[PDB]
Structure formats: C-alpha cells, structure tokens
Amino acid sequence: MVLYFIGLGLYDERDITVKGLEIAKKCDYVFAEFYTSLMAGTTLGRIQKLIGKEIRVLSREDVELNFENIVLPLAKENDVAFLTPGDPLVATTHAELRIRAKRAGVESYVIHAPSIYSAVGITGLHIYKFGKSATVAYPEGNWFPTSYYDVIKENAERGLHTLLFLDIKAEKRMYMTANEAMELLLKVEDMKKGGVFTDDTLVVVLARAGSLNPTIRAGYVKDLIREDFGDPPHILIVPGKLHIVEAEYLVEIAGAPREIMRVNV
Amino acid sequence: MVLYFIGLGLYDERDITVKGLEIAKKCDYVFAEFYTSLMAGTTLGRIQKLIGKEIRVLSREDVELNFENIVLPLAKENDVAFLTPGDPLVATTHAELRIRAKRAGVESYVIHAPSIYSAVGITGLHIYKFGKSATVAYPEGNWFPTSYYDVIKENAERGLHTLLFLDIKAEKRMYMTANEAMELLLKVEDMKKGGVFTDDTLVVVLARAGSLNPTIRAGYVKDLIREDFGDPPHILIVPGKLHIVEAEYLVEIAGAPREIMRVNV
Ligand SMILES: Nc1ncnc2c1ncn2[C@@H]1O[C@H](CSCC[C@H](N)C(=O)O)[C@@H](O)[C@H]1O
C-alpha cells in the first residue's frame, strides 16, 4: 500500500542516503528509472548488490505511459520503491507521478538525496545567487533550440549565476561535454550576437560531482574550450558578477586566473 | 591527514549518504556545527551512535573565528570530519573554510547530502523555474531587513519562483516560522507598496522536509498566515507564474484552492 520515491544521489552506489538504502531493502519490489539522468560512477549491478534486491529498470515510456500499470498495482498490496538518480522530483516529470499514486489509492513518500542542483555549492558560488536554470540540448536536423542562451542573458544582467544542465542521451549513455556546450554557446552567440557568451566569458565546469575527486575548473572560454575535464557527467555554469569571496574560492580551489578578481568582481 | 566536509541531511541521522557515513566511521576526529540549520528528527546522541564516534560540537564563533586553531591542526596528522545539517556548502559560508584548509596545507573533500534547496522539488514546483533566493531575517533593534522583498519582486516579474530561507538563532533556540515570515512580508509590503506580497498572494510552505510526512501546504496568505504548519524548520516559497502541472500538484498534494488550476495565460 506504499510507494517510496528514493533518490540515488549524484555519482555512485553509495550516494543514496542511509534512509533510502534501508527503506529500499525492506521493499517487496524495487523499480528504477535511468532516463532523467544516469549514475556514471557505478552500474546497475553494483546498485542491485548494495540494496540486495532485483531492480527492474523502467524506460521513459514505461513510466510516462504505463506507470499506473507497472508500478502502482504492486504498490497497492506491497511496499514498493522507485529509484531515481539524484533527488526525486527535481526532474520536472517526477512530480505528477505522485498524483497518479493518489488517484490509484496508493500512498507515496519521498526519500531525498543529493542533487546536482544543490551540489553546485562546491563551486564556491553562493547558492542564493543562482537564477533560473536551463538545459543545453544538442541541435538536431533543422531543430536548433537556443532558449538556454536567453536564460543566461536574463540571469547575468541581474548579476545572477546560471546553472546549465548538459544534454544526455540516456539510452546511448552519451554525455554532452562542457567543451561541446561551450562550442554550442559560441555558435548561438555568433547568431544572436547579444554579447552573452564569448571567448572572454568566465565559466565554471563541474565534472563528476559526488565523486571524491570532482574536477572543478574556472576560467575564460578561450582557455577552457579545449581543456580536458575528465569523464562525465559535466555541468557548465556561467556566473554573474562575483562576490570577492566567490572569486577567491574559484582562484584557490578551481584554478581560476587572478584576472577574474578584477574583471568579474 | 585530510579534512572531510560531510552533510548530514535534512531531518534525521539517516539523511546522511552511505558514502558520508562510511567515511565518517573511519575518521580519527569528528567535529560538527548545528547552527546553520535545524535537524528536527534526531539528536546528537543518535548521530554519535550511528557514526560510532564522539562528536565535538562547535559554535559559530568556534568555526568562524577558530576553525584553523581547533579543526585544522588535527587534520594534519589525522583524518578529520566536519559535519553540518543538510549540504555543507548550501546557504552557509563554509566554502571559505576550504581556503583555510589549503593555507594550512590540508587537503579537503566534500561529501554532499540532501539539501532544502533541492528538496523544494517536493512542492511540485519545477526546480528550473526557481530564481534568485533570499533569507527572511529577524529584525533587530531599529534595523528591519527588507532585501528579500526585492528578490521576490525581481523573480515574480520574470515568472520565477522565490525560495525563502527562514532565519534561525540556534543558541537562542529560535526558528522562524512561515507564519512569522508572512507577517514580516506584509509589513514590508505596506512600506514599499510594490504589490509584491499581499493577502491575496499564493504561497507554499514546506515544513520538516526530509521527514516521511512533511507539511506541504499551498494557498493564499490570508488563509495560511495563521495556520499551524507544525514544528520547525520551515521554508516559505512565493511561486511565480504557474504551469498547469504545477498547479495540479499544489491542488492534489498541497491542498491548494482548486481555482489556481485555472491559470491566466
Ligand atoms: N528539513 C527542512 N525543512 C524545511 N526548511 C528547512 C529544512 N532544512 C533547512 N531548511 C530551511 O533552510 C534554513 C537553513 S539554511 C542552511 C541549509 C542547509 N545547508 C541545507 O543544505 O539544507 C532553515 O532555517 C530553513 O528555513
């Protein structure tokens, strides 16, 4: 009679919380989705071994189209867990699943875990200064989405930082790199010419948040556009005007050039 | 000879990640601070029992003035951990402590935990739509803080959600409620006359996120201002323009007035 939405956290199988792990272990059935994002530092097998339960993976169609036929039925007579990378309900589509549960007569609870949305605190940038967030999507065919460029522009002119989630083709396990993201933004800039993203723009790259050894690098696009930030996943941030304390952390911890202390503060 | 910043999470001792617990258990010395937030579902004793180590609790003065004299000296010959509620680098000034660690020649690592900043996803409001954040601070003497009001205005004008962290006085044992926050905002409104926060404003309250049964309520200020949301900590949110799916969730899960679903596009 209970469905548990449990977050797996940022990177590997140990990023789930003690609460989530223990609840997952006592569940009769465990489902999981790996389409909103992936857990790059581990494998389904390693997660299954930690939880000590078989994990049935569900595709985007399984959930969006058949959540009430695959998950809820069992939840009606058993304790069921639904695992998701990161923190449940950060991904926009998760929320409505709780409504489906309610209508099915199923009780649901949320077990939180770290999300990249909050983990960016490790960049040294103040969390309150982050504005609207956006996702950089790979252009396809004649489709060239550019709304993320506008998000940066609007946040930046208000002195706010912009968190850019990078595209991920979940099925193919293909991650957009921060390099690809910078190349795309420079291309959008050349088209809109809004003076929003250029070779002189300061950016921050966070790779493998959650890992003990994430890559945290800050610098100008001209210098970072071809730098190796390591294995995925990558997150790109275009900060707004910096507080001196943010700048000092970027220089000391993220290898930023001293120049940011006079150009971006 | 390392220093670990480890988050304990939102509500109880089980909100720590397995990774954080594993590492904490093996450290030689374990320190912690409990003034940046409130974990309403546990106690020092339960946390100590979980990690199997004595926890040296530090005050704001101990940390801000003497972190390098109390914690770092030990980190040079031992594995040391510094615990904090939620995520150690969200809505705190602890990031600067990593610079202090560097200066002392001490390598530091960060272990994330569930944060209220991302936990707000449980309100059903799309995370990417949250704009700049702010803190509603208790007025003191003849000083009456009002910066948070201007944040709401700026975000609302862009159709963005505003997360309002509520003040805390750990040593005084004072935890600002959503009610008190609303009372304060109404007073700022009467003063600035911006039409930003009134009795007809729709707001959302999230209390004790992390618990299995947090209090999630949405409605107009006039109806919620004197409602009992339970024990602290509390967080207040002033939504921007709602998507229909957000409204649906607030109505079905947070008990908001069914009328909000009739959005005015
Ligand atoms: N479980 C919880 N429920 C509701 N609000 C919470 C909360 N935990 C923290 N807050 C809110 O955030 C304030 C502390 S700000 C420090 C936040 C912490 N680093 C984190 O990552 O969560 C509190 O005064 C309260 O307004």
From Swiss-Prot, chains A, B:
Gene3D superfamilies named among the record's database cross-references: Cobalt-precorrin-4 Transmethylase, Domain 1, Methyltransferase, Cobalt-precorrin-4 Transmethylase, Domain 2
MF (Gene Ontology): diphthine synthase activity
GO BP terms in the entry: methylation; protein histidyl modification to diphthamide
Major enzyme class: transferase
Pathway per the UniProt entry: Protein modification; peptidyl-diphthamide biosynthesis
Positions that bind S-adenosyl-L-methionine: L10, D87, V90, S115, I116, L166, A209, H234
Enzyme Commission identifier(s): 2.1.1.98
Keyword Glycoprotein: no
Keywords: Methyltransferase, S-adenosyl-L-methionine, Transferase
Family according to the record: Belongs to the diphthine synthase family.
Quaternary context: Homodimer.
Full protein name: Diphthine synthase
Organism: Pyrococcus horikoshii (strain ATCC 700860 / DSM 12428 / JCM 9974 / NBRC 100139 / OT-3)
